[PDB]
Amino acid sequence: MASRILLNNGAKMPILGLGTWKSPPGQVTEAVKVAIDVGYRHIDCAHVYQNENEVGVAIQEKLREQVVKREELFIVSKLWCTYHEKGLVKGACQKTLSDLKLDYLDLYLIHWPTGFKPGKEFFPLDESGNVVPSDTNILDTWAAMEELVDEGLVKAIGISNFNHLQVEMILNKPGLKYKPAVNQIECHPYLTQEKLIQYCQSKGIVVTAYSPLGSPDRPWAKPEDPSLLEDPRIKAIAAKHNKTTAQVLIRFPMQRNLVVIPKSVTPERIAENFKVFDFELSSQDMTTLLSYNRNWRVCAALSCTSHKDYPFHEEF
């Protein structure tokens, strides 16, 4: 298992990174510090997570301690939906850079294909409970992302939560300057993403699997929802390897040539979750885990189902 995957800009992206959604500001600094100590080099961030300042504190400390240098880190962030207007993209990226205390990102993603009404609220809703969209489109937002590469603010650009037709839109764009390097999508045994992964990989786009543990901390979880970490069939695979269920769930996407970004703020779990380069899942294990697909999404953006660019009406 090589620890990095080559992107279309010649850079190498660590296949195991630390997620930071719902890592509270009061805990994320320690989380990132520990992660860096134990070998994480890739950190997945976003302005919408409201903790980039505190991620930045951790990175700054570890740079100053001489634990890592900047070139060894792979820092990812994402353009939030309220900043899809071409005139807002650079300022949104620069806010992220200022909070992270960095002068470039290794990768900057369009967080969702859906643009929302610009304003202070991250999720502007109307009386029907539906999001208020913006008059933005994928191709113009992409052109604004491209300018960030041209200006040296980001080394690579990509997308997140795009369906294959939305990816195709960018790929077919007249005058395209940079292909998306990465599509970051939800992926785990209950949402195995065979078709979208095959599509992206065939196009030279690296896939990053988010919510690989099934995001048990997600805010809209219901008591009846499937729970991957507690699935006894996965516990059984883990026991056979003398590993934890999380370790199996992290190794699974790695063996599909995906990048994976498990989130924790708990130091012991951060360290444990990285110990996935000392075992292999068998063909039977992989097949069994793939067979658990139920097309069950934890991140279905249910307030956005009427947005013109909602990604999940399409099969993939």
Ligand SMILES: NC(=O)c1ccc[n+]([C@@H]2O[C@H](COP(=O)([O-])OP(=O)(O)OC[C@H]3O[C@@H](n4cnc5c(N)ncnc54)[C@H](OP(=O)(O)O)[C@@H]3O)[C@@H](O)[C@H]2O)c1
């Ligand atoms: N692009 C997008 O739209 C999008 C959407 C969702 C997620 N993401 C990215 O993907 C990252 C990962 O997804 P996620 O945060 O949704 O969920 P996840 O990584 O599937 O699961 C995170 C949860 O698992 C717990 N956990 C972590 N390690 C564990 C272990 N060894 N044993 C037991 N529980 C463990 C964490 O608890 P503690 O933290 O309390 O230890 C947390 O509650 C996010 O943080 C974010 O960076 C992106």
